[PDB]
Design a protein around this ligand. Structure first.
Ligand SMILES: CNC(=O)[C@@H](C1CCOCC1)N(C[C@H](c1ccccc1)c1ccccn1)C(=O)c1cc(C)c(=O)n(C)c1
Length: 112
């Protein structure tokens, strides 16, 4: 089916985002933000829907994503949270922008 093929494309993108090739800028997005650990006591007041690649991986493994759009919405939410919370000149924002460039260019090659 088309939905199967498009979700294989998404799974390939997910595997690439988690790969050693992108680890230098992808690592901030590997696991949920631990606000308490970092003293970011405003994080959950500002970010109502946290997202990270471990959560995307769990949802893909559990067949939670019914289509590519649902997968893309979660990956883009992860970047949006980073752009919303952090000052735009912070290193983590530069790293989000680099990983989003990897995501958007490969996502755009979606099989019809
Ligand atoms: C204990 N947590 C961390 O130190 C790590 C996690 C360690 C476990 O794997 C996931 C990342 N960071 C990244 C960290 C950082 C600390 C605080 C403020 C912003 C980023 C970072 C990034 C880039 C460069 C230097 N440091 C975060 O939680 C993290 C990530 C994102 C996307 C974010 O928006 N925020 C606010 C925090």
């Amino acid at each position: 089916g088309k939905l199967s093929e498009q979700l294989k494309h998404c799974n390939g993108i997910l595997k690439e985002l988690l790969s050693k090739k992108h680890a230098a800028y992808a690592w901030p997005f590997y696991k949920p933000v631990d606000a308490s650990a970092l003293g970011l006591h405003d994080y959950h007041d500002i970010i109502k829907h946290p997202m990270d690649l471990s959560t995307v991986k769990r949802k893909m493994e559990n067949r939670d994503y019914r289509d590519a759009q649902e997968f893309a919405a979660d990956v883009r939410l992860m970047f949006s949270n980073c752009y919303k919370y952090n000052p735009p000149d912070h290193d983590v924002v530069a790293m989000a922008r680099k990983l989003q460039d990897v995501f958007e260019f490969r996502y755009a090659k979606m099989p019809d």
